[PDB]
Give the backbone structure.
Amino acid sequence: DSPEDFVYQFKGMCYFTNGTERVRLVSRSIYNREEIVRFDSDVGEFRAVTLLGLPAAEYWNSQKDILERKRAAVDRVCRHNYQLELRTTLQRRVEPTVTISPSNLLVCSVTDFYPAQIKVRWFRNDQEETAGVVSTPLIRNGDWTFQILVMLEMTPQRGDVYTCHVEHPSLQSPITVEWRA
Amino acid sequence: IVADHVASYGVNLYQSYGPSGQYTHEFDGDEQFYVDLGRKETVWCLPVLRQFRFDPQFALTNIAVLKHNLNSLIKRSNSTAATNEVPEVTVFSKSPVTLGQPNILICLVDNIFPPVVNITWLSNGHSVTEGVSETSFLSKSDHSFFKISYLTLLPSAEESYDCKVEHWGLDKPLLKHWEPE
Amino acid sequence: AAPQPELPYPQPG
Amino acid sequence: DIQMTQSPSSVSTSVGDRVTITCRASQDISNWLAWYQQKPGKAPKLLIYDSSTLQSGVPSRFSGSGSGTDFTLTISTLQPEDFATYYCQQFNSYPLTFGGGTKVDIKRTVAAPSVFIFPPSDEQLKSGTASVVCLLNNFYPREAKVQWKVDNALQSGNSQESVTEQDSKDSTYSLSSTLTLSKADYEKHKVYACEVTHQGLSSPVTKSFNRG
Amino acid sequence: QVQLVQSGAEVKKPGSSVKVSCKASGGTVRSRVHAISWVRQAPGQGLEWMGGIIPIFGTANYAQKFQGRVTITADESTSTAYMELSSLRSEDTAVYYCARDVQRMGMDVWGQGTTVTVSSASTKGPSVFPLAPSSKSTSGGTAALGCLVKDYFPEPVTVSWNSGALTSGVHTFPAVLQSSGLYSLSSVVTVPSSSLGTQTYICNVNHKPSNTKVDKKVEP
Ligand SMILES: *[C@@H]1O[C@H](CO[C@@H]2O[C@@H](C)[C@@H](O)[C@@H](O)[C@@H]2O)[C@@H](O[C@@H]2O[C@H](CO)[C@@H](O[C@@H]3O[C@H](CO[C@@H]4O[C@H](CO)[C@@H](O)[C@H](O)[C@@H]4O)[C@@H](O)[C@H](O[C@@H]4O[C@H](CO)[C@@H](O)[C@H](O)[C@@H]4O)[C@@H]3O)[C@H](O)[C@H]2NC(C)=O)[C@H](O[C@@H]2O[C@@H](C)[C@@H](O)[C@@H](O)[C@@H]2O)[C@H]1NC(C)=O
Ligand SMILES: *[C@@H]1O[C@H](CO)[C@@H](O[C@@H]2O[C@H](CO)[C@@H](O)[C@H](O)[C@H]2NC(C)=O)[C@H](O)[C@H]1NC(C)=O
Ligand SMILES: *[C@@H]1O[C@H](CO)[C@@H](O)[C@H](O)[C@H]1NC(C)=O
Ligand SMILES: [Cl-]
Ligand SMILES: [Cl-]
Ligand SMILES: [Cl-]
């Protein structure tokens, strides 16, 4: 018998595709965890998502001044802010640090990179390995960097060289890190 | 919804417990800033963003609207309270562990609802106050939240750690252990 | 240079 | 703080004219700008918000435009009821700030003022104070300079001015300037003059009198 | 749409405090989330934002110029917002306005305004002095004469000429608050110079606060 709580959320969400060619605003009104009413710029008017949002949708769609502010938001909010992102967050480049260590398993740690696009692959004597590879999901550190770990099941022979191969938009060419038994 | 990039301008939260509220902007799932409602102050999370200005009264005025909206919804819902969710906790380091080398322990608390939580750290069983920081509550598309706590540390053979989480969805405090290995 | 916020409106009585 | 600069301070126009008022912000305020109309003795009335959105009920001849730092209000076919003072106001950040206002009055024929001077009455002199009054009657345009001279000494800080509302027929104004002295100082000097500078005069007109 | 109705005119002594109220009535849900602003307008000056508060939530906002000397409060339960100004000085004489905005869509509703006059004066009837026509108050064939109505408090006075018979050519000027704390205005009239010593010109001054009616004959 824990304390009682009531929650309301409002989310002004902008969806960008291919620069600013395709921009879409979805403003969501949520009571507890149920979204009750939303303005979708591709619709052009408020819509009730559930029964509880029906009074709001009918009221807000009757206010011309509210409706015209919502329709303008895809430009006043989404497109305006994206121009600031283009100078800042979309310019952020953090190059990944790549290290290998054993665990029989080889672990390639790819740590502290931004943005999220990344490609990591294992090589055994310059042959690409696809069997016995385990990849973590992309790990969001919360401080605007990601990490990922890629494990390789291995039974090395003498002379074997294992290469962890990392491609990321911040790099002028892929990083390779080698490991020998 | 298909999108190269998704932003929240912003996330507006208000809840009866406290009561309390939160205002943030997010871009591609990371927090850009929050407004300290009590201090009337924008607090940027990324240094390149500090060249920008966001008027804190935007947040405060929005929360005022949300307070009224929560009132109407409690009334309209015949006082339908939030459901407590069981959170999920994971602890990991930011970089691979080298004994003696500065690292950061990261505690991801996922699936938080309602947004009321205690996240603290233990070292060898006693609480750790210095070197601790955390994000705001970060939004999810199912309208729960996650939160990430950080603890700086020098990894050392004889020193292990726990991330301790208290939440109304948990019968007793949750401890997630980390060893330097 | 300032990011613009989207704004909520009062729920009906 | 954000400074709002309105230009011009005043403009004279005729009924049916297009009039454009300008407001400039000391920094970028996006579209957070409102315009107000105020008539003497009345509360301001909102015309435009969000820089270009027309408040409900407001006549369509009012429009606003601009973004960033430079903004304009346009009255497309000015009506007799539109002669008033207009204010811009920034809604970008707190504290909110208003511009200095633009007064729109009626244009008409340049008319020089008839200048009259009045010495203090004997009934006031027995009371211990002396008020000298200079009257500028039925002039246009509004701008007029009045300077008091006591024995060829420019007075400052001991006079107040007062103006009538614009006459709706010939668009003229009237002004009174009152000089206030002690009785003792008044009986110390002889020549009392008010010098008027006005557009309708070739030279500054001086009305004077000698005490007694 | 909501209506804002403010408290009545105030006369305050230098150094005292005034608290002007603003009560909202007959609004939609917008009035439950709107922001109240206080705007002052000094005589002959522009609008000047002082500060504001959202009655339903949070603390008050202030301009630097008014910081620490004005206090803005609100009471949701009585639908009334307040503005308290302390250590009043002569420069504080002004019209104080109540207004509201909904999510910054302009201040769309205003109160009627509240006059606050700062002076040390008690009720005082006017002195009526002749502004007598002379060689230096004539122009062509017309002469100018009038009445100086001085040192009365508070406002207003009513001024007529010849018990209302004379209205053409009359200019009664707005009152001005002198540095003494008392008001002062002039009324003038232009008349044919030929009728000066023939037609009797009397200005009728009435000051209701002091129960004073004055009739003053203006002659050369
Ligand atoms: C991703 O978005 C890009 C860019 O779109 C633009 O930039 C964004 C940032 C936004 O501003 C957005 O709103 C803009 O539209 C888009 O590329 C654009 O695609 C369109 C449609 O294919 C192209 O229009 C075509 O242009 C040619 C010639 O254009 C000229 O060539 C130069 C090359 O230097 C070009 O850069 C200049 O713009 C220049 O003016 C026309 O000849 C062509 O023919 C017309 O087609 C009309 C219908 O489409 C028809 O009505 C007419 O009668 C006539 O037949 C047409 O106008 C546009 O040029 C192009 N711009 C750029 C910079 O690439 C992507 O779509 C791409 O388009 C191709 C160029 C190619 O790369 C495609 O493979 C690709 O799909 C968007 N991506 C996706 C996946 O959709
Ligand atoms: C977070 O921690 C605080 C403080 O430890 C908890 O609040 C305490 O709750 C107990 C109930 O067992 C009270 O007796 C104390 O007086 C409270 N102290 C304070 C400072 O509030 C709170 O319950 C914890 N939150 C959660 C979600 O577990
Ligand atoms: C909520 O409670 C009221 C009063 O008991 C009732 O009339 C109403 O029907 C209830 N809600 C629903 C959805 O039935
Ligand atoms: Cl706009
Ligand atoms: Cl109300
Ligand atoms: Cl209303």
Q: What stands out?
A: Chain A has two domains: 1-91, 92-181.
